Amino acid sequence: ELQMTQSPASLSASVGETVTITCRASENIYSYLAWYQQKQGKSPQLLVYNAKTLAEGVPSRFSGSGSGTQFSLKINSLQPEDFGSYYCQHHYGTPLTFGAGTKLELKRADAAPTVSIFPPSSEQLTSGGASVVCFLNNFYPKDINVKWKIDGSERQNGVLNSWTDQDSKDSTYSMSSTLTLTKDEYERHNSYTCEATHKTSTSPIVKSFNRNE
């Protein structure tokens, strides 16, 4: 099928700044190209159609350009309401296809995650399971790596991570990482460590506890 290659996948910017998102079609689609905006937890909204015509209600700071196989959406002097995801879509013929999306996020000062580790609750243990939870909260930028070590050795199996999108109030990100083991598995080991690698530190942030201590 016709493929739309959209870039960048992710873009950071400040209010007042001008940014450009690009979309390449694998075939000549003339000027049949649309752009959409999708904010967190909302349905998409049309911004541009016919490559350059603004949709109803769209501010003049947005502009679409291009015709053939290369297109771009430019946003002059970004406003706070402009952060969210953007998608291109050709509207030449069926099948209709979309670009993979660009996530436009708001720049703010770096922030190291506040890392907190929690041993399995005694209540969960009586039930037989053992989940070790680690929260890595309010950090920026979003890129982060979490590693679990049990008695000095990295553990991979049994880890489930969940992330929040950029906070609408402070522009940070948060993450939760949970290592789930059986109670038997849990009771065989002693030291449990959650290690976070983030640009704010050359060395990882390490939080840990000893089951028997």
Next chain:
Amino acid sequence: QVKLLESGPELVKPGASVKMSCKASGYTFTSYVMHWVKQKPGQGLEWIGYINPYNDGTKYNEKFKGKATLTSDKSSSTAYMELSSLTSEDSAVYYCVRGGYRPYYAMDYWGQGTSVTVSSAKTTPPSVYPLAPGSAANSMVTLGCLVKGYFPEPVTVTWNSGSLSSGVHTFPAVLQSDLYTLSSSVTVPSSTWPSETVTCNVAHPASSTKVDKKIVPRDC
């Protein structure tokens, strides 16, 4: 206005079918084509196909050939999409979307989306576990609540019945072996906990369950 009233969320087993609807109002139904688009959580958009209510003409994405069937009823200004032989891969939000008046392949009014969840799981209330810091683990302290193994979504988590909200982080649920698990953290001044009570309130309407758990310091 323009309004698209979509049918409620669907919870069905693998191999079953679901038929969703979207009742349009606020414009002349037959003057616009109706597209359908699939979006999985945190992922992109995929076009399924469209129907032109004026002449019943349809076009389908070959990728959905055989799984999706689009129909419409002019009498009630309603468009329908039936998905068959469902598997968990079909779990997603599905939008009915009005095409533009002239550029009818541009999607100018998107519905709210109908959530479809395909699973063999049975209703399961969550196990709610209070998370207090280890005995060993300064101005602030972070506490947590693990809401594990429930089905189906969603659950609502509040702290001190909502009085604590600014320092709260409730994370998206993750699916593991057919059941959902999520966690929520709250950060408060160390001068307030444990001297004052902090409670996790969890609600899971599907199982008609409500649980309140005070976060208590570990007896170590």
